Design a protein around this nucleic acid. Structure first.
Ligand SMILES: N[C@@H](Cc1c[nH]c2ccccc12)C(=O)O
Ligand SMILES: N[C@@H](Cc1c[nH]c2ccccc12)C(=O)O
Ligand SMILES: N[C@@H](Cc1c[nH]c2ccccc12)C(=O)O
Ligand SMILES: N[C@@H](Cc1c[nH]c2ccccc12)C(=O)O
Lengths: 104, 104, 104, 104
DNA sequence: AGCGTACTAGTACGCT
DNA sequence: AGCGTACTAGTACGCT
């Protein structure tokens, strides 16, 4: 939400800035300053939502439990598992297969 | 927005789920799959908000422009600059001083 | 609003000046002069904002009403409840659990 | 600032709530939870402003330096010393004289 | 359906 | 005079 422009016009300024973040975080990891950087850059709520999403993504690829079970284990809405499910469908083959290795 | 509990109870699990994210992303960067991973894990809006926060944090450390100017440059609400400002106050000395190197 | 520095520089002096306040107020309570001391030391507006914050913090721990409700009851902006909410998230376990005793 | 009503009407709700704070802090001091309580209740900026005010009040009573000097030592505006000066004028005799003991 | 929370809008006010 | 920041207004959006 950033006053939703859907405008091809400047959805561009708010991407090169995102890449600047991606790069800075990159250095942070290398200097071991990623944790405080992520504490500075994300809110507590964002960090938690992210915790849940990795579990969802992991378990989905794992496929050892129905989505209804996953939702119970995590205390999540089913909508949130579907978001992971559809996103995963769109992820590149490379990413999906690398995830099934590290995450499994 | 996950049933806000402040609950000493399990803010640890979701916290441990969050650390699982931190580690995975760590690997992603190392394997050069961070970009799609972050495209899979965050929504377009989160990516953008993050772009703006790096700018805010950078310009605040830089301290060459008032916050009223920063707000006009970024098209942000003053409240968002204050969140960065207060957060920065809370950041570790280590982090603030490294940011002022890479980010300046 | 005192020349926001984040400056490792002297955030200790002003911090040590702040601790001088904490100790003086301590004495005030013990001698029953806290009320005028607090009338001397804070402005009318700070006292009032503080009244609203205790309510927010109390009601959030209590967790019996939604934040939309809290906001109407108190005539506050939602942003002010979120500040309380996030602040509470960061409070030590000792504090949150004692608050839930005296404040509930 | 709380949308400035000057209205004798409800400047009252936003006083009994303030007394609730004064009382809660009281307990906090007794149980040694005043520090985290004050970290939860005040913003960083409020704590710092408070450090400066105690110094101002102490030094004014002390009267060993002109106000122009005080201002330099503290890096304060002269307006801020005048607020202290005028407030001190209005403080009860009891308070002023107790201050001159503990603070001097 | 409801709820928590980050955000752009634009104020007041304590400070230097 | 200028500046930092807490606030009421009311949005969007991720969540359960
Ligand atoms: N940790 C910050 C995250 C944040 C939100 N908005 C920001 C703007 C700038 C920098 C950081 C932030 C917070 O919880 O408030
Ligand atoms: N890219 C995903 C991000 C996401 C949101 N919720 C999720 C839950 C699980 C995994 C990913 C997500 C999206 O925009 O929808
Ligand atoms: N420490 C809190 C102080 C605060 C501001 N607004 C609040 C509302 C409720 C409770 C605490 C607060 C902060 O800096 O944000
Ligand atoms: N009661 C004082 C609070 C105050 C503001 N600035 C100060 C400076 C010094 C001492 C007290 C103060 C007032 O409303 O003005």
């Amino acid at each position: 939400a950033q006053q939703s422009p859907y405008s091809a016009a400047m959805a561009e300024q708010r991407h090169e800035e995102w890449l600047r973040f991606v790069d800075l975080l990159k250095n942070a990891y290398q200097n071991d300053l990623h944790l405080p950087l992520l504490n500075l850059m994300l809110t507590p709520d964002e960090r938690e939502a992210l915790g849940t999403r990795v579990r969802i993504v992991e378990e989905l690829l794992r496929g050892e439990m129905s989505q209804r079970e996953l939702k119970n284990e995590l205390g999540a809405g089913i909508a949130t598992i579907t978001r992971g499910s559809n996103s995963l469908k769109a992820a590149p083959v490379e990413l999906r297969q690398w995830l099934e290795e590290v995450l499994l």
